[PDB]
Design a protein around this ligand. Sequence first.
Ligand SMILES: O=P(O)(O)OC[C@H]1O[C@](O)(CO)[C@@H](O)[C@@H]1O
Ligand SMILES: O=P(O)(O)OC[C@H]1O[C@](O)(CO)[C@@H](O)[C@@H]1O
Ligand SMILES: O=P(O)(O)OC[C@H]1O[C@](O)(CO)[C@@H](O)[C@@H]1O
Ligand SMILES: O=P(O)(O)OC[C@H]1O[C@](O)(CO)[C@@H](O)[C@@H]1O
Ligand SMILES: [Mg+2]
Ligand SMILES: [Mg+2]
Ligand SMILES: [Mg+2]
Ligand SMILES: [Mg+2]
Ligand SMILES: [Mg+2]
Ligand SMILES: [Mg+2]
Ligand SMILES: [Mg+2]
Ligand SMILES: [Mg+2]
Ligand SMILES: [Mg+2]
Ligand SMILES: [Mg+2]
Ligand SMILES: [Mg+2]
Ligand SMILES: [Mg+2]
Lengths: 329, 329, 329, 329
Amino acid sequence: DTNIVTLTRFVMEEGRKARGTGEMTQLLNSLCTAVKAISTAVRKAGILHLYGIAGSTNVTGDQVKKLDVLSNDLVINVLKSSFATCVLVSEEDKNAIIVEPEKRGKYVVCFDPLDGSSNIDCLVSIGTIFGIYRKNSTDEPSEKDALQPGRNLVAAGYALYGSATMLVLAMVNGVNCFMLDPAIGEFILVDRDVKIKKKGSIYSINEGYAKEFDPAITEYIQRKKFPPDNSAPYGARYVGSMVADVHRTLVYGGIFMYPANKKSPKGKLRLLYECNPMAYVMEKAGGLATTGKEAVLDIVPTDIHQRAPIILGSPEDVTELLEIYQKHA
Amino acid sequence: DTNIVTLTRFVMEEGRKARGTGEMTQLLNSLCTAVKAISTAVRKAGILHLYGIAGSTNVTGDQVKKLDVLSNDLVINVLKSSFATCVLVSEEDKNAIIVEPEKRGKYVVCFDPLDGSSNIDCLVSIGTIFGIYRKNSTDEPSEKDALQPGRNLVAAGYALYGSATMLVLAMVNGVNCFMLDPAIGEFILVDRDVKIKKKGSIYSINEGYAKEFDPAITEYIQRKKFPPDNSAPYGARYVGSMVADVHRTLVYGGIFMYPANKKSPKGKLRLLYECNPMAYVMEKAGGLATTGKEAVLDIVPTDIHQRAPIILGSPEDVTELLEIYQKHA
Amino acid sequence: DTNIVTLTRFVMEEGRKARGTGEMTQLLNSLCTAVKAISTAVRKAGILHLYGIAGSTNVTGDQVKKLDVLSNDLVINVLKSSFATCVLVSEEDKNAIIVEPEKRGKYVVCFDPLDGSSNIDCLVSIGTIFGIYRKNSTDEPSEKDALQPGRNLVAAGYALYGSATMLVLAMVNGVNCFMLDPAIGEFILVDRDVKIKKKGSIYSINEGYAKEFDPAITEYIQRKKFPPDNSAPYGARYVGSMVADVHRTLVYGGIFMYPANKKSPKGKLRLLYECNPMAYVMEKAGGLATTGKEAVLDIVPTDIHQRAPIILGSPEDVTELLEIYQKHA
Amino acid sequence: DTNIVTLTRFVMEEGRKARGTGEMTQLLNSLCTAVKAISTAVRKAGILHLYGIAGSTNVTGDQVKKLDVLSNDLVINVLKSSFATCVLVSEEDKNAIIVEPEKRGKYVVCFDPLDGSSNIDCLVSIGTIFGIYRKNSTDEPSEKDALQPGRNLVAAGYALYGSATMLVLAMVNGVNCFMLDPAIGEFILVDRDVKIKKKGSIYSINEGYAKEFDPAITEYIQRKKFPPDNSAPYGARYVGSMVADVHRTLVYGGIFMYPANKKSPKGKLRLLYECNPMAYVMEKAGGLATTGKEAVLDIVPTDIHQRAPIILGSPEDVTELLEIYQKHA
Ligand SMILES: O=P(O)(O)OC[C@H]1O[C@](O)(CO)[C@@H](O)[C@@H]1O
Ligand SMILES: O=P(O)(O)OC[C@H]1O[C@](O)(CO)[C@@H](O)[C@@H]1O
Ligand SMILES: O=P(O)(O)OC[C@H]1O[C@](O)(CO)[C@@H](O)[C@@H]1O
Ligand SMILES: O=P(O)(O)OC[C@H]1O[C@](O)(CO)[C@@H](O)[C@@H]1O
Ligand SMILES: [Mg+2]
Ligand SMILES: [Mg+2]
Ligand SMILES: [Mg+2]
Ligand SMILES: [Mg+2]
Ligand SMILES: [Mg+2]
Ligand SMILES: [Mg+2]
Ligand SMILES: [Mg+2]
Ligand SMILES: [Mg+2]
Ligand SMILES: [Mg+2]
Ligand SMILES: [Mg+2]
Ligand SMILES: [Mg+2]
Ligand SMILES: [Mg+2]
């Protein structure tokens, strides 16, 4: 046990193939430090009096929590000091953050410092989501640099603060899971080249929105409960934190859904720092991610805080739902 | 911050009122040690290779996981060395465990060493549930000592290994939450005299069993989705771990349900170490816990592993469901 | 590894022999909590900005450090809430602290909340020392209750914050070492019935006081450096923290000395909370502890802060020094 | 507290000045991981059963301890995976270790995986020492690459596992101290541009070697005990672990000595991984390090395990001893 395969070694030994400037490793290294700090505070939030609100409303509705601010500050700071980023997009910040010339790098990072706001106080799993882009312009860095389709992602993933803290990282060639060892403070590889099952047996959605669901979603759920071929009905799971439900979908298979509805044409989840990163992870794992009409990763954003419906998980499950939408179109 | 209000001080300063032998404090102290050990292993289960099965089937169906065995061993051992117990009942053990004469105490403890088996590998919140009884007999200790109705509980609660580890403890006069501070290894009081809201806005149940639900449950869910008075529909949440869903119900209010169905006359959850402890906590917090026809705490068990349907949470929500059952009776 | 032999179990399973009120276990339990808190802060004192002075001078000369105050507060508080003490004596407090009637127990505790003041800022090992007496009076508790000879100790020991944190505990039948496992926050038994070697090969004293040493000490040191029988000279060690040097003497054997000198008739170390506890530990381990003229444990104190010369360690080494004193008398 | 100034940021933001390949940061990053792992095991060595011998004798006399092997393995592995080293020299390895072509970097690292062997079992402070050189040759990497005078060091320091774990790092422009925060597993800057006092009041040496000391050392010690100008005698301190005694000398000032003697012409401490790193740190802090006749950093080694006498600390103290040697020459 004297040869620790940390996330840093893995990535460094990864980018070795395509010998680069090595700033991706600097970036992920910095992010890991922020995630460990968030994890430490979360595991003892009540003792630190970190539950409750901070007294503010972000770019859209959400009532800002104390952990939102703390985690947001930690991420912004480590990313800047990494000398690997130039444009930062955060759920908590109205406008994109342009990194000062002195600490600029070539990457653009979109992130949700803390996902699962509604589950903080009840101690349910929460997390951090991020998507990383390569600046594809010569002009001065600006918000436009973050308005790229998810297909242009070079790296994406999330930190899940669940029963254990896990950092799930996806890059061009695959998905790997690294678990944080609290004792030495290192993320250690525990799952290599993760692939999602072709078909699962769990569906995840907030059925409290039944009244607003479109005919397609309605039909699909009914089918999951009453299989036309007498097969066993799917089990239902909905933790309430996107990071938790998506991670379960990844390792157990099945489908996760936050579709558009009669009151929300574009669903709720944010495209830049919620939908695209998860869609990217899902596809590198052999899964699918759709709005119900088009691939999430192919949407070209016009607003860093725009929303997007999302249906992701096992290919056969997502495809089954797609056929329903096509049928009702 | 030099006056730590630990669970031990709290209880000790509690039992002071009714000056006893002090073995309840010894018992809870021992249990806290087991819970801290479980929490430590869980937060790093993958690194310790604790995911997966152990190769056995407990008293009923459940496929035994590695953490089931580890947690079960830890609990049995600390309880025995506490010199405060005489009869132990565990989900993992076919028959009751009689404590050797040398280490016998007056309490009977029923527990689920690790609840949320299906959510272990996906890193979703899991926990430990326990119920404590006072031996009300003169005969040699036996399994019969554990066959008491939940109303005879003198203490009950659970350890939740969620975003933070919390030990929720209920006794005759109330419910208190203690959070584990990983740094010093002490459970610290963070929530005093917890009370559940009279009415919530979240319903929690596995709707994958829609085909097997009785008319009452079916009507209630439909009502939560389509309120007859145009009020906002309830939100849906179902983590999949009883300890996680019940804790959210406690702090946020609402209702949790694992009713009987066409294939399970007595539901799934176990009365002794799952239903009664949660029912007890719920009632000391001002909530209700019913099978749909009778109070869970009033059932007189005949099998230490018998099952019982359970509906618990905010009084007004549970009562609303009860009226439906009565209506359909 | 599911049967943790903690200090609590050990003691509880110890006092079982002479079934008592069990408050000694409550007392040691409380003390363990304070020691874990001190250990946590010490391992990260610089990050917490706990180095430096607090701006005060205790009962005698010593310039009060920030950790002196923090550790003192923690110990006082846990001891009071233990319901096992009535009179407290601390190096940091001018007068004895009488516990309020409501939380009174039968034990008297003398302690040095933090020993090794001069080694704090250089990160050298430091610790906590304590001696416990049974109140042998009917009168209201007072300072006089702490003025008992060390031979009346019922328990004594120290917490060493060295490369690892160790709690060394001595009672009527022996000495045992318990190491703090930072991960679960429990002191675990690692050394049972510790006994010191009859003769060692290390001498420990501050030779910077050569000019003030009496003829006996001078002769002994010279003999350690130039053995009259051509044996190998003893090695010298002097960490500067009594707890560190005494612990090394215990496990490696040898001698530790802080004798009286031409400017300090009664040495420097305090009898109540430094000399007696270490003398007690030393004797229960088969060692000796003398002033050079009389056994430390036999001195009847008249001042809770009085000083006493001390020579302790392997019997043959201490006896050799005693013969020198007798020779020069 | 959301802007953590870690060792990594510091160094990275340091090497920024002289924009390099950045592999020094990779190297220090890797080393930090090994040091955290060693620190974790040390703080709980007894519980892990890591005390005792491994059953082997290194390059010279020393009886190999279990922690020697563990720490040695950890350091070798992290250094290799860093892609920043080509030649490794370890106290535990008879010959230099040549890094495989695939993972070669430009630095040569000499280190003592665990210093203070004799103080392990008594829980006294121990540590890790390292010195880093830049390969100044075109030939294939070999042992000769490590045979450079200490003046060619580009970085050196040590990890002290004392009351707190501290990583002291010296480079061309100065010395900085970083303390390990066990909670998040990051070394945090706590002391910037450290400078040693010009004159101290503590002398540190094993006086058990009085019989073998040369006239100069003998005279100096006598002078420290009996000041010719009636000034206060110096205090004596000798922990027994070079890393602990040197760190105290650095922060408190004074002198540390392990001179040659009648039986050891070149002292005991090893030049490559003990003397040079400490001499380098000492000089960057404004101190001195001599054999008594020549500067340690100017010695050109001929054996990777050769020994060297060493006298270091406050300039005025070291100079005073030098004048004595010159006087006796
Ligand atoms: O309560 P709702 O509408 O189901 O929203 C839950 C979703 O919202 C989020 O909290 C984002 O705000 C996701 O983490 C989660 O999937
Ligand atoms: O998958 P299902 O049938 O919803 O069962 C989930 C329930 O089973 C349990 O895992 C008990 O086995 C509970 O913790 C949880 O509430
Ligand atoms: O610096 P001196 O005089 O050797 O004193 C050291 C002694 O003083 C103490 O720090 C007590 O104040 C002991 O821990 C230690 O043994
Ligand atoms: O016991 P001695 O001869 O004083 O040796 C102590 C010295 O040896 C070392 O342990 C090296 O082996 C140093 O850490 C320490 O300074
Ligand atoms: Mg939000
Ligand atoms: Mg979110
Ligand atoms: Mg968020
Ligand atoms: Mg089970
Ligand atoms: Mg269960
Ligand atoms: Mg279970
Ligand atoms: Mg003092
Ligand atoms: Mg002291
Ligand atoms: Mg003190
Ligand atoms: Mg050695
Ligand atoms: Mg060494
Ligand atoms: Mg060594």
